[PDB]
Amino acid sequence: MRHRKSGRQLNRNSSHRQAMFRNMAGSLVRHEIIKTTLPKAKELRRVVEPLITLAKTDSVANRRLAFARTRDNEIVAKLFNELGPRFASRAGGYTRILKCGFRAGDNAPMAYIELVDRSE
Amino acid sequence: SNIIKQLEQEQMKQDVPSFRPGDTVEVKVWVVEGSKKRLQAFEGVVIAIRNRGLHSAFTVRKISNGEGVERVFQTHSPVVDSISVKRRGAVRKAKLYYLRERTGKAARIKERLN
Amino acid sequence: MIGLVGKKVGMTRIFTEDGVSIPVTVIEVEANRVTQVKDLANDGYRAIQVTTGAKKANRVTKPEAGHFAKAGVEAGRGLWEFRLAEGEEFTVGQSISVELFADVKKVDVTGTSKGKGFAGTVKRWNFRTQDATHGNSLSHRVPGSIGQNQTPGKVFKGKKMAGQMGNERVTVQSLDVVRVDAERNLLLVKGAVPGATGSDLIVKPAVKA
Amino acid sequence: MIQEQTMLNVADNSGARRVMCIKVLGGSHRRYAGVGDIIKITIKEAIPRGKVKKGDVLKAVVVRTKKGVRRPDGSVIRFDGNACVLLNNNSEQPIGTRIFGPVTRELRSEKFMKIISLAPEV
Amino acid sequence: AVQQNKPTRSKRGMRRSHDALTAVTSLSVDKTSGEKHLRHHITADGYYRGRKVIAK
RNA sequence: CGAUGUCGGCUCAUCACAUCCUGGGGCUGAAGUAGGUCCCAAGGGUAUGGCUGUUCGCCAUUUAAAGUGGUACGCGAGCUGGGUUUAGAACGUCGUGAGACAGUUCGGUCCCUAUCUGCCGUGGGCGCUGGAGAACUGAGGGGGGCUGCUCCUAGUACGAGAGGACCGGAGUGGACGCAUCACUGGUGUUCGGGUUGUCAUGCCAAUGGCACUGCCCGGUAGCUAAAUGCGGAAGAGAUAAGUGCUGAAAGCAUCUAAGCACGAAACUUGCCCCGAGAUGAGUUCUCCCUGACCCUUUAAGGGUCCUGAAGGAACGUUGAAGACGACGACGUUGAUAGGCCGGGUGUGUAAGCGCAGCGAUGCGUUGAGCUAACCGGUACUAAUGAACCGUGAGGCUUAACCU
RNA sequence: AAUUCCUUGUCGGGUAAGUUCCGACCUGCACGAAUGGCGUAAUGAUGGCCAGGCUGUCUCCACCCGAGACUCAGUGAAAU
RNA sequence: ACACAGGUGGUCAGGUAGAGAAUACCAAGGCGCUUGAGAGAACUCGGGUGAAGGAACUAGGCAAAAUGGUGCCGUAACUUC
């Protein structure tokens, strides 16, 4: 059935998919733009949209939330300040994903995902 | 909405307390059964609280020594006389289905209130 | 004699001071309008046709728009027909409400079953499953042998066999009318009634004996 | 609950405490008896001061149920285990003149009339 | 083992005609990119449906 | 004799009767009650365990009964492997020995990369006559083929006495079949807590991994039977057996021969549900292209100019739908899905700090923190413009109407 | 009776039911005195029976997780 | 057969739990095993989770679940003590 099960499989188990996204989920917060395949660029938003939502305003004990996804405190020091408050007027709508090319090892379309307010 | 989210609101009793699970309440009824009134009570501890539907069902466990007795009550039934709010209780759980066995110190549930 | 359409809006225990609990299914009607009276289409017989608000009148394509071309000019999302008796009728578009069941004690309701896909022969026909030890080899969900041994050399017709389940016509014709609320156009009937909340449920007076 | 080959408790006076279920009866393919059902019993154990013999067979009526009993419009009562009142073989009614415990007021049928000739709760 | 009594080239066609030759989708061309492309996919001109972001 | 898989048991069926139980009618050494008997009936119902490889035969307990017979001993690329079928060990019996048991004991296997044919699902084709779809009616075909217990009628009349049908439903259930989650509980690795050891963690505190859902305990969406409500009813038709007339055969008589009316759980309907690929493609409604030239071979072809219609295959964001199609919704001109905001629900009072306590830990801040599928808003994100296949009123004959 | 086919010999026990098991008989077809008698401690990948615990085998299946099967692309058969 | 999760004599190894070279987890040490890219129907196989009963199953509790360590208490039938 796979009845109302959310999120694309993207091979193997949930921790392998998490380790695959761990190669790019920090790069998107660091550089405010990242490239990968069309399905991966759409699914890379999961937990990361809720983490930008968590970063709009300051509360207690929140620095450790989602940290098992990427265990890097540099991209977490970006939250509540250099990322988050810039979207507080709109309360949502943080990121956009578009097509840019194709692979040759597989027939994967390439796509880029970025933040809608960034200096470059 | 012409009746959804309004169906229960005009048939529930507004004058009813919020008592939580793990609490010692005393419940009183007239029985009636389509005949005459008779004032009766039931005592014990609430093991599961009222929530869903117009029936709003909750369960009371008697916890008396050497016996096991359990009674279900539906909150908005027209023969309910009163809830006496007899003695407070405080617990670290939402359900107490284990009081069907353990009626000693496990059922001497802390009052916590002043 | 006539009928209406509505949707399931709840399932509630309503209570009484009479010692009965009374579970009811709650139905809210579309306030459906007449399209036309159908006379001289079957000899000595008459019927009424009804429709409802289309929600979006641009969804009717050329082969289905014709149902409403005989009801004015445009749309209605569904069509239903009901029998008439002991009088002739003239119509302009007047609404039908729940008030036709204020003294009628029992109704006839077309609910239909839920979708189940393939559903499995082991549940769709209650087909047996015993333990895997000292028993079956690699084929344990199938409807036994569908063919006839030797001389007929053919598949047995009407045997309980594999297929699909759900969306099947389930009708109830003995259910009790409990209450009508006319100003809110609402109907209460005893116990449970089959059908999804999105389905338009047909309600008629009962003629079951 | 109240199945064959599984033990039962007694509510009748001065004859047995612990007894065995051997028939559920009362119609066709019936199961899971409520209060007011009749059950066929054997005296699994007796005691020498009482009125009954070990291994003797009779009927009993159900009065205490692990599945509980319904009567009012929104409340259900249930107990631990299951108990029954022993009956006379050919004239019916309870054997004794008294009954143990609070039992039931939902049961009043004319085969068990002795239950309204008493006052177990009030 | 094997398919016994070899079928005619007419009877053989029944095991080809549902999968050989099936229809294909004609190539798309955009109002601002003249290069032929697939219905969902990016052109060799560097655009899809001519849609830009934060550019004039 | 160019192999024919060999009994039981499990698992799944079917044809038909010799009537086991229910229906309708007669007989009796038929008072009431009960038994014995066969007429109409093969429609519908008709068993679990113990001891026996079963069959034959018993015991235990129910049944409304535990009825009977056929089918390469129905049903082994269906299952198992008891009895029969090799190889081991022993008690007794026959023997020179091979071997024998109208004598026993303890042990002892089940081969196959589904080709065609068959069915079934979606796909596709051909096609209902230039073309597309939905609805409506339906030759017909399926479903359905039934009842325990409690009580009054009935403690009568009948019969020393014992005991004592059915009159049609009242009270209450069910095999069997179907559907649903309000009841009452279960389940819920997609939500929350508790907790043992161990790793990442400088260390301490925390947080998150690891032990498949580590182990203990709750639960949403949904699922579900331990739960719940339904349906085999009534009405009608025509017959058989039967009840009688009209009446021979037989100048009378007779219920059967012809004749006339009645008269069954059999037989047909009623009820319920599907059906026009039903090639015999029913009957409607919605929708749309109204052009010629030359030559000739014409139920036909070649050469030429002006012209491209209804529709359909395709492409979506996805769910309450689902093998894949389809089904419901669905394309910025949009609340279909995700994000966002709040609501509902579930769990049970987090971190840090302040305080106490040798410490473990507790208390307060804290009705805390966290939250999935349920729900109302909100265009932040997304869901081709184009194109592909497809023309010019379509054979034969005619009433009718205008040229 | 590892020893009696006929024979479920036969009494009593256990169980709702006992061609199984235990004690026992004494008309053992064909037991029985070193191709031995009768009994037995200890022993068993030992044969037969009973009692008890525990149990999703089952009453009745309700549910979920993992791995194939599944598709395209490189390589791509065979028995008959 | 083979570039095969296979077989092969001697002797060697730090902590934490433990009697231990059993066993669990860090540490020294070793690894991606010569087809790629993805999805999630029937159905086949393995596992975990389950209300109230319970051996009814079967030749047979088969399969499945329960018990599980160590010190102290206490100890049947039988005995060559």
XYZ file of all heavy atoms in Angstrom, chain H residues 18-36:
410
model
P 31.737 -7.081 36.556
O 30.898 -7.259 37.757
O 33.119 -6.584 36.730
O 31.846 -8.484 35.823
C 30.720 -9.341 35.722
C 31.077 -10.614 34.959
O 31.476 -10.330 33.621
C 32.222 -11.426 35.571
O 31.863 -12.223 36.695
C 32.627 -12.274 34.371
O 31.728 -13.355 34.195
C 32.461 -11.273 33.222
N 33.745 -10.587 32.972
C 34.313 -9.581 33.700
N 35.576 -9.370 33.441
C 35.862 -10.318 32.455
C 37.099 -10.658 31.809
O 38.234 -10.284 32.089
N 36.948 -11.571 30.797
C 35.775 -12.173 30.507
N 35.812 -12.962 29.477
N 34.624 -11.981 31.152
C 34.731 -11.021 32.117
P 32.936 -12.558 37.828
O 32.201 -13.091 38.994
O 33.788 -11.370 38.012
O 33.852 -13.708 37.231
C 34.954 -14.203 37.992
C 35.688 -15.322 37.251
O 34.855 -16.455 37.105
C 36.186 -14.934 35.856
O 37.424 -14.235 35.885
C 36.288 -16.307 35.191
O 37.524 -16.977 35.437
C 35.189 -17.111 35.895
N 33.941 -17.275 35.114
C 32.866 -16.429 35.005
N 31.825 -16.940 34.396
C 32.264 -18.233 34.073
C 31.697 -19.358 33.434
N 30.485 -19.414 32.920
N 32.395 -20.483 33.273
C 33.652 -20.492 33.690
N 34.325 -19.529 34.292
C 33.561 -18.419 34.473
P 37.806 -13.205 34.738
O 39.171 -12.708 35.019
O 36.727 -12.207 34.669
O 37.853 -14.046 33.387
C 38.939 -14.930 33.130
C 38.670 -15.808 31.904
O 37.548 -16.643 32.113
C 38.423 -15.018 30.619
O 39.649 -14.670 29.978
C 37.556 -15.976 29.808
O 38.345 -16.840 29.012
C 36.860 -16.810 30.885
N 35.433 -16.455 31.074
C 34.862 -15.364 31.670
N 33.551 -15.391 31.713
C 33.233 -16.598 31.096
C 31.973 -17.236 30.838
O 30.837 -16.852 31.108
N 32.090 -18.443 30.204
C 33.278 -18.967 29.809
N 33.250 -20.137 29.260
N 34.466 -18.424 30.032
C 34.381 -17.236 30.684
P 39.682 -13.737 28.694
O 41.040 -13.160 28.626
O 38.521 -12.836 28.756
O 39.511 -14.672 27.425
C 39.351 -14.056 26.141
C 39.505 -15.050 24.983
O 40.841 -15.530 24.904
C 38.574 -16.260 25.057
O 38.132 -16.576 23.744
C 39.540 -17.330 25.586
O 39.120 -18.652 25.340
C 40.803 -16.936 24.817
N 42.056 -17.473 25.384
C 42.737 -17.039 26.490
N 43.842 -17.695 26.746
C 43.860 -18.666 25.738
C 44.706 -19.752 25.420
N 45.757 -20.131 26.119
N 44.484 -20.508 24.348
C 43.438 -20.203 23.588
N 42.533 -19.250 23.768
C 42.793 -18.519 24.888
P 36.884 -15.840 23.091
O 36.792 -16.262 21.682
O 36.937 -14.401 23.372
O 35.650 -16.452 23.870
C 35.310 -17.814 23.693
C 33.960 -18.133 24.339
O 34.019 -18.089 25.758
C 32.848 -17.178 23.916
O 32.282 -17.437 22.640
C 31.848 -17.454 25.035
O 31.126 -18.642 24.793
C 32.750 -17.674 26.253
N 32.910 -16.443 27.051
C 34.058 -15.743 27.320
N 33.886 -14.716 28.103
C 32.507 -14.734 28.359
C 31.613 -13.930 29.104
N 31.916 -12.899 29.856
N 30.316 -14.215 29.157
C 29.876 -15.269 28.498
N 30.583 -16.119 27.761
C 31.907 -15.784 27.725
P 32.176 -16.272 21.564
O 31.359 -16.748 20.424
O 33.540 -15.777 21.306
O 31.353 -15.169 22.342
C 29.976 -15.352 22.634
C 29.494 -14.305 23.625
O 30.176 -14.392 24.870
C 29.681 -12.866 23.164
O 28.771 -12.471 22.157
C 29.472 -12.153 24.500
O 28.134 -12.165 24.962
C 30.251 -13.093 25.427
N 31.659 -12.639 25.596
C 31.881 -11.655 26.552
O 30.969 -11.148 27.204
N 33.187 -11.290 26.780
C 34.283 -11.765 26.108
O 35.399 -11.350 26.389
C 33.985 -12.746 25.100
C 32.709 -13.153 24.865
P 29.181 -11.399 21.060
O 28.181 -11.500 19.989
O 30.604 -11.560 20.709
O 29.027 -9.995 21.765
C 27.742 -9.431 21.973
C 27.812 -8.260 22.946
O 28.400 -8.628 24.191
C 28.628 -7.081 22.434
O 27.961 -6.326 21.435
C 28.863 -6.337 23.746
O 27.705 -5.651 24.194
C 29.136 -7.523 24.686
N 30.580 -7.872 24.741
C 31.316 -8.696 23.928
N 32.580 -8.799 24.255
C 32.686 -7.963 25.370
C 33.730 -7.581 26.249
N 34.993 -7.958 26.198
N 33.495 -6.734 27.240
C 32.275 -6.250 27.385
N 31.198 -6.506 26.654
C 31.474 -7.386 25.658
P 28.797 -5.522 20.351
O 27.833 -4.960 19.388
O 29.865 -6.403 19.838
O 29.513 -4.350 21.125
C 28.802 -3.250 21.659
C 29.766 -2.312 22.375
O 30.359 -2.982 23.486
C 30.906 -1.818 21.474
O 30.552 -0.682 20.690
C 32.017 -1.575 22.505
O 32.022 -0.257 23.016
C 31.697 -2.543 23.649
N 32.641 -3.697 23.657
C 33.593 -3.791 24.683
O 33.574 -3.041 25.648
N 34.620 -4.665 24.601
C 34.671 -5.478 23.573
N 35.695 -6.275 23.533
C 33.713 -5.468 22.527
C 32.704 -4.566 22.602
P 31.562 -0.055 19.631
O 30.798 0.881 18.787
O 32.295 -1.162 18.981
O 32.580 0.790 20.509
C 33.805 1.248 19.959
C 34.653 1.924 21.033
O 34.610 1.194 22.261
C 36.131 2.054 20.644
O 36.414 3.257 19.962
C 36.791 2.025 22.029
O 36.671 3.247 22.724
C 35.925 1.008 22.771
N 36.403 -0.390 22.597
C 37.543 -0.806 23.300
O 38.177 -0.039 24.024
N 37.996 -2.074 23.186
C 37.307 -2.917 22.449
N 37.760 -4.128 22.376
C 36.115 -2.574 21.770
C 35.699 -1.296 21.852
P 37.694 3.440 19.046
O 37.944 4.888 19.012
O 37.498 2.727 17.775
O 38.908 2.745 19.792
C 39.825 3.461 20.591
C 41.074 2.623 20.828
O 40.800 1.478 21.625
C 41.723 2.129 19.533
O 42.475 3.122 18.845
C 42.549 0.967 20.091
O 43.742 1.381 20.741
C 41.592 0.400 21.148
N 40.704 -0.649 20.595
C 39.415 -0.542 20.133
N 38.873 -1.663 19.753
C 39.913 -2.587 19.964
C 40.067 -3.979 19.788
N 39.147 -4.804 19.346
N 41.211 -4.595 20.096
C 42.211 -3.856 20.538
N 42.229 -2.552 20.762
C 41.031 -1.972 20.455
P 42.834 2.962 17.302
O 43.476 4.206 16.844
O 41.648 2.474 16.571
O 43.934 1.828 17.271
C 45.272 2.077 17.664
C 46.077 0.788 17.632
O 45.516 -0.187 18.507
C 46.103 0.149 16.247
O 46.975 0.748 15.299
C 46.526 -1.262 16.634
O 47.895 -1.376 16.975
C 45.682 -1.457 17.899
N 44.370 -2.046 17.544
C 43.169 -1.442 17.244
N 42.201 -2.268 16.969
C 42.828 -3.515 17.052
C 42.416 -4.849 16.873
N 41.195 -5.214 16.549
N 43.282 -5.854 17.018
C 44.541 -5.559 17.311
N 45.079 -4.367 17.492
C 44.151 -3.380 17.369
P 46.489 0.931 13.796
O 47.621 1.411 12.977
O 45.227 1.691 13.802
O 46.127 -0.513 13.312
C 47.100 -1.520 13.158
C 46.397 -2.832 12.872
O 45.485 -3.193 13.908
C 45.566 -2.804 11.591
O 46.345 -2.827 10.404
C 44.710 -4.046 11.835
O 45.426 -5.260 11.718
C 44.369 -3.844 13.319
N 43.153 -3.008 13.456
C 43.044 -1.661 13.659
N 41.831 -1.191 13.553
C 41.071 -2.318 13.264
C 39.670 -2.463 12.987
O 38.799 -1.591 12.956
N 39.316 -3.753 12.690
C 40.178 -4.804 12.720
N 39.705 -5.968 12.396
N 41.486 -4.712 12.949
C 41.871 -3.437 13.222
P 45.888 -2.026 9.107
O 46.991 -2.145 8.129
O 45.462 -0.676 9.515
O 44.631 -2.828 8.549
C 44.821 -4.133 8.020
C 43.491 -4.866 7.845
O 42.755 -4.910 9.061
C 42.568 -4.257 6.791
O 42.934 -4.580 5.461
C 41.238 -4.872 7.224
O 41.106 -6.226 6.847
C 41.369 -4.818 8.753
N 40.770 -3.568 9.261
C 41.358 -2.423 9.723
N 40.513 -1.460 9.977
C 39.264 -2.011 9.655
C 37.926 -1.474 9.672
O 37.542 -0.350 9.979
N 36.973 -2.353 9.221
C 37.247 -3.621 8.840
N 36.267 -4.354 8.405
N 38.459 -4.164 8.808
C 39.426 -3.303 9.231
P 42.522 -3.647 4.233
O 43.142 -4.232 3.031
O 42.858 -2.255 4.584
O 40.943 -3.745 4.119
C 40.317 -4.924 3.650
C 38.801 -4.739 3.563
O 38.235 -4.362 4.810
C 38.368 -3.693 2.534
O 38.429 -4.199 1.207
C 36.946 -3.421 3.035
O 36.041 -4.379 2.548
C 37.054 -3.611 4.555
N 37.064 -2.309 5.267
C 35.843 -1.650 5.458
O 34.789 -2.097 5.019
N 35.785 -0.484 6.125
C 36.894 -0.010 6.643
N 36.759 1.116 7.262
C 38.170 -0.599 6.442
C 38.222 -1.753 5.743
P 38.197 -3.298 -0.087
O 38.725 -4.067 -1.226
O 38.790 -1.971 0.148
O 36.626 -3.112 -0.320
C 35.826 -4.194 -0.786
C 34.364 -3.780 -1.045
O 33.773 -3.286 0.153
C 34.175 -2.717 -2.143
O 32.945 -2.946 -2.828
C 34.117 -1.459 -1.285
O 33.523 -0.328 -1.905
C 33.336 -1.960 -0.077
N 33.559 -1.093 1.088
C 34.761 -0.713 1.625
N 34.680 0.244 2.503
C 33.310 0.527 2.527
C 32.587 1.537 3.229
O 33.033 2.407 3.959
N 31.231 1.508 3.010
C 30.623 0.621 2.203
N 29.341 0.794 2.040
N 31.248 -0.299 1.467
C 32.607 -0.304 1.691
P 32.922 -3.592 -4.281
O 33.825 -2.812 -5.162
O 31.505 -3.770 -4.670
O 33.525 -5.044 -4.091
C 34.893 -5.320 -4.355
C 35.245 -6.737 -3.926
O 35.030 -6.922 -2.540
C 34.510 -7.832 -4.694
O 35.461 -8.474 -5.535
C 33.956 -8.725 -3.566
O 34.086 -10.114 -3.815
C 34.759 -8.284 -2.336
N 34.050 -8.411 -1.036
C 34.720 -8.971 0.059
O 35.915 -9.279 0.012
N 34.069 -9.158 1.237
C 32.807 -8.786 1.329
N 32.188 -9.026 2.443
C 32.117 -8.119 0.287
C 32.772 -7.935 -0.882
P 35.022 -9.337 -6.776
O 33.748 -10.015 -6.470
O 36.182 -10.173 -7.156
O 34.802 -8.330 -7.984
C 33.676 -7.476 -8.045
C 33.456 -6.992 -9.476
O 34.530 -6.168 -9.901
C 33.336 -8.153 -10.468
O 32.143 -7.993 -11.211
C 34.600 -7.976 -11.331
O 34.485 -8.455 -12.656
C 34.824 -6.466 -11.249
N 36.198 -5.966 -11.557
C 36.320 -4.755 -12.252
O 35.385 -4.164 -12.785
N 37.579 -4.197 -12.320
C 38.744 -4.794 -11.917
O 39.824 -4.258 -12.138
C 38.558 -6.041 -11.225
C 37.325 -6.582 -11.049
P 30.796 -8.667 -10.717
O 30.543 -8.360 -9.287
O 30.836 -10.072 -11.136
O 29.725 -7.883 -11.601
C 29.075 -6.743 -11.064
C 28.820 -5.700 -12.150
O 27.932 -6.142 -13.168
C 28.173 -4.491 -11.492
O 29.157 -3.689 -10.860
C 27.475 -3.851 -12.697
O 28.346 -2.989 -13.407
C 27.138 -5.038 -13.595
N 25.680 -5.336 -13.544
C 24.838 -4.557 -14.346
O 25.251 -3.735 -15.162
N 23.486 -4.773 -14.227
C 22.885 -5.709 -13.420
O 21.657 -5.803 -13.378
C 23.811 -6.495 -12.638
C 25.155 -6.298 -12.707
P 28.754 -2.480 -9.933
O 29.968 -1.810 -9.452
O 27.773 -2.963 -8.936
O 28.055 -1.508 -10.957
C 27.145 -0.528 -10.529
C 26.605 0.199 -11.750
O 25.907 -0.682 -12.602
C 25.662 1.324 -11.356
O 26.434 2.493 -11.219
C 24.658 1.360 -12.516
O 25.035 2.190 -13.600
C 24.699 -0.075 -13.029
N 23.552 -0.884 -12.564
C 23.536 -1.996 -11.761
N 22.376 -2.599 -11.700
C 21.562 -1.817 -12.532
C 20.193 -1.959 -12.948
O 19.393 -2.852 -12.680
N 19.771 -0.964 -13.807
C 20.559 0.052 -14.227
N 20.050 0.930 -15.044
N 21.825 0.218 -13.875
C 22.273 -0.752 -13.029
